[PDB]
């Protein structure tokens, strides 16, 4: 197994312009959406076929009721936050919780809040304490840190429950999440502005999206490499690239994907 992850996001919007839910929730395994809920449908629904086929209807019924509750919690906290800040009008409140299971056997877990899309409160499950970015966050910090049992509960959830959900969903979606589609890599040479040769090394067709690409001179490290984003091709695979300039030493593109290494010599 490669590194895998489970993440749940919440998004609250006070005073939303028509057509924007006041509350949206979405879970992910790796890059794949698995679950969704919002304040318009007021239902938690699967977003992936392997989630729908493996989780009985009483699962979605139970989490429908909790998200309804959690939407009301988010509405009320946003109101208090705005009161602390003395903010009128429309503002956003966000939460991310999740965990990772890396190849190493070692795990991670995290829990974070943002207000207006900036860091607000960061939980440390190893010291069981919240980090506050300012004095309003410091007030909430004191409230949450005074409930000792609640911090122990979060630590337990990140370290045991979250990892066990992830292992469950990996088995459900293993045919999607554990597969490998290797990349197609090509190198393109071209003289650009007079006397400037750009080399592009370009990859597509691959999955998982994680991929390593770099340029090397004579077999040792490279100058300034330009990196293209890993982008979804819309068919379940990904694409990316890396480029350098030379002018006229000989170069090679090096690609790493799912434990297979590739060299393209220019």
């Amino acid at each position, epitope marked *: 197994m490669r590194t895998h992850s489970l993440r749940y996001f919440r998004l609250g919007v006070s005073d939303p312009i028509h057509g924007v839910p006041e509350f949206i929730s979405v879970g992910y395994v790796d890059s794949h959406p698995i679950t969704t809920y919002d304040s318009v449908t007021r239902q938690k629904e699967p977003r992936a076929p392997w989630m729908a086929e493996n989780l009985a209807p009483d699962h979605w019924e139970r989490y429908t*009721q909790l998200l*309804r*509750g959690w939407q009301q919690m988010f509405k009320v906290e946003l109101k208090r936050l705005q009161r602390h800040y003395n903010h009128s009008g429309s503002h956003t409140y966000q939460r991310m919780i999740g965990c990772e299971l890396l190849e190493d056997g070692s795990t991670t877990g995290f829990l974070q809040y943002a207000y207006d899309g900036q860091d607000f409160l960061i939980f440390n499950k190893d010291t069981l304490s919240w980090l506050a970015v300012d004095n309003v966050a410091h007030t909430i910090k004191q409230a949450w840190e005074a409930n000792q049992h*609640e911090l122990l509960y979060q630590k337990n*959830w990140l370290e045991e429950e979250c990892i*066990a959900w992830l292992k469950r969903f990996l088995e459900y979606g293993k045919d999607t999440l554990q597969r490998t589609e290797p990349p197609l890599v090509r190198v393109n040479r071209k003289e650009t502005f007079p006397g400037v040769t750009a080399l592009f090394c370009k990859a597509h067709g691959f999955y998982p999206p994680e991929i390593y690409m770099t340029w090397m001179k004579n077999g040792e490290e490279i100058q300034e490499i330009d990196y293209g984003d890993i982008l979804p091709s819309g068919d379940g695979t990904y694409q990316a690239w890396a480029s350098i300039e030379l002018d006229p030493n000989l170069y090679s593109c090096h690609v790493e994907h799912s434990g297979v290494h590739m060299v393209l010599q220019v």
Partner: antibody, heavy 109, light 114 residues
């Protein structure tokens, strides 16, 4: 989850110690609660454990081993007052409470 | 904290009745349990927050109304001798908060006779 197990009844002598066991086998774990319910009255919250160890509140203590799926409520210096039922309850992976059938504790003078 | 009525009720078979429960603790979640000899509490219906309800373990022969944030009624549609029991209303700050305890009302003893 499926099962919570705790003895039906327990008798101990006033001034001594008693340990009420609770084994749980659930699907996921999010906490173990102990409640006290006097005869003909409502249950009231005694303790909460979610990580391993022993929490002590006065003459009462509650223990949890998450790997043995196991908790006990410990009562020291028993008093007649302590006669009541003791409810064991576990939150499962979907935050539902699975309740044990309770342990009636009898104090002999 | 939690107020529940009535404490005791005799009913004839086929009669209806409503149990009332009110909490003024600004709690979001309320529950209706029945307690029967030799078994754990069984959750009939619950309300994870104002504006929503769902069945519990033994909903048949009951329904509920979360009237407002404070109040959670339980109705016996057509009292059966099997519904002879002690009924507990309970509330808690939220649902899905791991360490939140329940706060119970005093109980309603109901006996249904032919």
């Amino acid at each position: 989850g499926q099962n919570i197990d705790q003895p039906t009844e327990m008798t101990a002598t006033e001034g001594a110690i008693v340990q009420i066991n609770c084994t749980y086998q659930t699907s996921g774990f999010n906490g173990l609660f102990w409640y006290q319910q006097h005869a003909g009255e409502a249950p009231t919250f005694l303790s909460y454990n979610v990580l391993d160890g022993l929490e002590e509140k006065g003459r009462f203590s509650s223990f949890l081993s998450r790997s043995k799926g196991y908790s006990y409520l410990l009562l020291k210096e028993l008093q007649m007052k302590d006669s009541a039922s003791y409810l064991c309850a576990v939150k499962d992976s979907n935050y539902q409470l699975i309740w044990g059938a309770g342990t009636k504790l009898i104090i002999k003078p | 904290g939690v107020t529940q009525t009535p404490k005791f009720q005799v009913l004839k078979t086929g009669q209806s009745m409503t149990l009332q429960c009110a909490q003024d603790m600004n709690h979001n979640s309320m529950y209706w349990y029945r307690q029967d000899p030799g078994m754990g509490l069984r959750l009939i219906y619950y309300s994870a927050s104002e504006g929503t309800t769902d069945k519990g373990e033994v909903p048949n022969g009951y329904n509920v109304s979360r009237l407002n944030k404070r109040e959670f009624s339980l109705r016996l549609e057509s009292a059966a001798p099997s519904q002879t029991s002690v009924y507990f209303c309970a509330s808690s700050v939220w649902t899905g908060e791991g360490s939140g305890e329940l706060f119970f009302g005093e109980g309603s003893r109901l006996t249904v006779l032919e």
